[PDB]
């Protein structure tokens, strides 16, 4: 190997799978790469080919000083986290923008530490807020809530709070630059590459197929928990209204069906998205950007608003309201999607902008730098 | 450069986790990846994190036909695939004949991949020499007409590279490689071994050398208790590997159903095993010495042979081993810094290889030429 390289991910499927390519980049290039991860989740992490470090106490992160277990930094879990760090020694921990687990074990053994992005960096944007704020208030009053926080878990260890601690040395940011929120940080632009655990090809997704298909669904981490609930139904009997194949995802509940809606616990949604004509969803990161690497034009029903707004607003997709749409609207707005071939152009657009930012292959090197200065 | 890429492996675990990190390397850098895998075994390919692609009957190891993928629901299967997909680029496994067939019936670029020495190709051109000093009248290739028809079926031709690829990706390192006259890619071997889940005894440092033994490889007689019992005779704790009643175990012998192989041997001294590729390579790259029992079923003698030649392992004959054997080898490979140092240069060797990740744009230029 060259770099010893240690992620620590939410343990939330949405927020893993987008780390799952950049890990394996890494990996690809002949470095070591371990995911830390609570021992209930073990398995997501061998699900995706990686080495798994189960770390801490059994964690439902759905169901969730609660604060301090959903960013990883509760002494059980730091702790334990710690004693591994201390022995595997990384070089370099990349860490998921919502817990301070893997930058604070970072500072504390002086490795490199630079933080993954899911979703619109508000917390960078935020953060941004409070530090100009900060510096024109006096000296004496110059609080810093966060900072003081995250200076006690570092003391536990001997080390001392720097804004690294908050923002990471750089931050790998995989939406596409134009819908990046303007925060002065080092940002590290890098090509979504989709991930959405275990997918095998049915034969039928081996097929043409012979009328427009739409998908719909809602992110993995969304559909564990999850009256009311009418709103898919509205959108499944809505969107059957045209004559168009129909996949949605379901858990089982219902319902009778339009003979044109297929229903499915799981698909592999990457690869059924390079076949369908339109995707209807709920704003999740991992099924927005997914459509958006398809370039598959998108009806968006909600950072999800602002995501969606975004991608409306360079006509790739449109929106509904969650608590106001009916049928009909469903109907038009899929037809529009359908119908007017700017919409599929434009996403085409934004596809190939997105095949032209550094592939996670294209970030290894620059995070070997990173490591090496 | 967007690529569509599709592996076929034989459908053994052995053969499969040797692609693994290319399929990813090719992944990370934006392509389609897709490995086509026969239904009982898609498993093996989604808990790599890859996408796969159900393809045939079940499979379990015409006759031949099927070893090599090569029987009609196979091949059609893949073909119609295939047909559908148009990947740009086939890679396959160097004892299966699906993916070049179908490359060629569809005009796609392939490439083969190595699991071992190049036995097929070192055969291959004996017979292509023998030939070539034949009269025309008497070229006979039953390899070449045999595969002819099967190419047949789809309007295509045979061609030399049907049998060897267009180029051949070789993670062996290329210091054993058989005298053969081809395009060979040399590529770092990066280990990968199933689901890997570091367990809390792998925590703790070792307090004396730990000596692995492994089953050669998932494949899967009680010369396995002759292995055990010796390693024993020194002050060493082992590892290693199954359930099973052959008696007492000694005190220093710690048995574990699962291990996470290359985690492991970051902390082993000596790994004793039955000659497996993927075993070999995983020690080899952690720079551990071996002591190697090869059978068998192909080359494991030579790579084994070779190891000892380069001095970063023993070899024991088995059949004809004693537990003082055992003993004494293992005892040179802890007592003589040799071993480990050699296993070092090798490891070192190893690591200046372009990795799958530098193989990469050396395929898509393929692809693109």
């Known amino acids: 190997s060259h770099m010893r390289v240690l992620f620590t991910p939410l343990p939330a499927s949405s927020h893993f799978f987008n780390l799952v390519p950049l890990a394996w980049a890494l990996r690809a290039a002949g470095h070591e790469v371990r995911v830390a991860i609570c ?3 073990v398995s997501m992490v061998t699900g995706a080919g990686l080495t798994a470090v189960p770390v801490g106490d059994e964690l439902d992160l759905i169901s969730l000083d609660a604060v301090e277990q959903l960013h990883l930094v509760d002494d059980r879990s730091l702790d334990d986290l710690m004693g591994f760090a201390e022995k595997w020694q990384p070089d370099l921990v990349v860490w998921d923008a919502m817990v301070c ?11 490199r530490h630079v933080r993954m992005l899911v979703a619109l960096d508000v917390s960078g944007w935020l953060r941004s807020g409070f530090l100009e704020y900060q510096e024109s208030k006096p000296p004496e009053q110059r609080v810093d809530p966060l900072g003081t926080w995250l200076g006690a878990k570092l003391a536990k260890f001997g080390a001392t709070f720097d804004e690294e601690i908050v923002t990471g040395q750089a931050t790998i940011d995989p939406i596409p630059s134009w819908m990046r929120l303007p925060v002065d940080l080092d940002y590290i632009s890098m090509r979504f590459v989709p ?4 997918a095998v090809l049915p034969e039928w997704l081996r097929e043409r197929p012979t009328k427009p298909r739409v998908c719909i669904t809602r992110g993995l981490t969304k559909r564990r928990l999850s009256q009311e609930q009418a709103m898919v ?3 499944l009997r809505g969107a059957a209204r045209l004559d168009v194949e129909v996949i949605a995802t379901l858990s089982d509940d219902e319902v009778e069906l339009p003979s044109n809606v ?8 990457n690869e059924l998205l390079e076949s369908c004509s339109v995707i209807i969803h709920h704003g999740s990161t991992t ?6 690497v398809n370039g598959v034009p998108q009806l968006i029903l909600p950072d999800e608003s602002r995501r969606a707004e975004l991608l409306a607003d360079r006509g790739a997709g449109l929106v509904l309201d969650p608590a106001t749409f009916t049928e009909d609207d469903v109907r038009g707005q899929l037809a529009r999607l359908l119908d007017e071939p700017s919409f599929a152009a434009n996403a085409a ?4 902008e997105i095949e032209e ?3 996670p292959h294209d970030i290894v090197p620059r995070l070997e730098k990173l490591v090496a200065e």
């Open 39 to 41: 021992p209930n989740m």
């Open 101 to 111: 687990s893997g930058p604070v074990v970072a500072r504390a053994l002086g490795a």
């Open 195 to 198: 991930y959405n655990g275990p």
């Open 233 to 235: 139904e509205r959108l």
């Open 262 to 269: 297929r229903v499915h616990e799981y698909v592999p949604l």
């Open 287 to 292: 099924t927005q950007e997914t459509a958006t």
């Open 349 to 352: 657009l934004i596809r190939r």
């Open 357 to 359: 930012s550094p592939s």
